[PDB]
């Protein structure tokens, strides 16, 4: 399948070169997989989600996304126009308030929630969790992410936006999950992207168009935007049967575009997520 005039990041993940604008992908499109977006919520009524998104849990007075961040991230995972995996099921877990903030205890509870809640959902092709959040190092936060991964969920986490070594941030620094840095449309490391040996992969993160609250769209930047590209890619590859939740991060690294990014610090992987789709 081909989506013309796609957001640059979608085109990038199906291309061996920057500078194109068509996204190519197998029409299975993540059908039968599920992606949890652990964030500020999801505006599931947005036409872009086509009935495939739903809120399953909140720790606050509403499950609605009063911020936009979670809706944007969910759109990059699986919206019809802005998403990598256009037929996946999206489940929202609101661990962040409408200012985008959340306590680590709530975030940990949300991760353990997903590890159990997947047993209440139909995801025959596999389960992914996208975590576009983080703060300073916490062994308890890292352990929660490790549990979620161990339970059979492909965990993708943002590296962080500090232009610093991600070893000092959580859950970015957890070795067993997939830690995602950000790149721009010219294959440069995004100016704000964290780096370091704990990164597994880069995805598009600068000037990413996706869904927003109020049935709208906007372009924003962050490792928060790169992470759902990788989460959606994992769901897509799991539906194709090419990998599993436990092996998808390694598979994405194995099949990435290699050595194509600029300003990658010595010791950080030079790997850009790529779907290897041959039309």
Q: Resolution, in Å, please?
A: 1.1
Going by C-alpha positions, the residue among 117, 149, 150, 151 that lies closest to residue 131 is 149
Distance of CA 49 to the CA centre of its chain: 16
In a domain, 279, yes or no: no
In a domain, 277, yes or no: no
Number of domains forming the structure of the chain: 1
In a domain, 123, yes or no: yes
Question: Which technique was the structure solved with, according to the deposited record?
Answer: X-ray
According to DSSP, residue 164 is labeled S
Q: CA dihedral defined by 43, 48, 50, 55, rounded to 10 degrees?
A: -20
List, by residue number, the catalytic residues. 39, 69, 224
Q: Which segments are annotated as binding site for Ca(2+)?
A: 16, 175, 177, 200, 260
Distance of CA 38 to the CA centre of its chain: 10
* DSSP string computed for 215-232: TEEEEE-SHHHHHHHHHH
Query: How many other C-beta atoms are found inside a 10 Å radius of the C-beta of residue 254?
Result: 12
For residue 267, the enclosing domain spans 2-272
Question: CB under 8 Å to 148, separation ≥6 — which residues?
Answer: 111, 112, 114, 115, 129, 155, 177
In a domain, 211, yes or no: yes
According to DSSP, residue 210 is labeled E
Q: Which segments are annotated as binding site?
A: 16, 175, 177, 200, 260
Residue numbers after which the chain is interrupted (C to N above 2.5 A) read: none
Indicate the SS3 state at residue 251. Answer: helix
Q: Kindly report the CATH number assigned to the domain that includes residue 242.
A: 3.40.50.200
In a domain, 278, yes or no: no
């Amino acid at each position: 399948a081909a989506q013309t005039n796609a957001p640059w990041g979608l085109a990038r993940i199906s291309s061996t070169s920057p500078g194109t604008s068509t996204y190519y992908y197998d029409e299975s499109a993540g059908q039968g997989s599920c992606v949890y977006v652990i964030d500020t919520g999801i505006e599931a009524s947005h036409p872009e989600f086509e009935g495939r998104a739903q809120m399953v849990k909140t720790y606050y007075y509403s499950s609605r996304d009063g911020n936009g961040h979670g809706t944007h991230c969910a759109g990059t995972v699986g919206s019809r126009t802005y998403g990598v995996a256009k037929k996946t099921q999206l489940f929202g877990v609101k661990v962040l308030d409408d200012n985008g903030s959340g306590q680590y205890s709530t975030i940990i509870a949300g991760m353990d929630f997903v590890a159990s809640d997947k047993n209440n959902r139909n995801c025959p092709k596999g389960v992914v969790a996208s975590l576009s959040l983080g703060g300073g190092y916490s062994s308890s936060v890292n352990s929660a992410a490790a549990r979620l991964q161990s339970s059979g969920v492909m965990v993708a986490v943002a590296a962080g936006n500090n232009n610093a070594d991600a070893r000092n941030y959580s859950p970015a620094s957890e070795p067993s999950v997939c830690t995602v840095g950000a790149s721009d449309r010219y294959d440069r490391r995004s100016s704000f992207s964290n780096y370091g040996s704990v990164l597994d992969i880069f995805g598009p993160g600068t000037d990413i168009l996706s869904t927003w609250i109020g049935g709208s769209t906007r372009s924003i930047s962050g490792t928060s935007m790169a992470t759902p590209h990788v989460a959606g890619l994992a769901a897509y590859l799991m539906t194709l049967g090419k990998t599993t939740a436990a092996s998808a991060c390694r598979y994405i690294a194995d099949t990435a575009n290699k050595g194509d990014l600029s300003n990658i610090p010595f010791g950080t992987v030079n790997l850009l997520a790529y779907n290897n789709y041959q039309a």
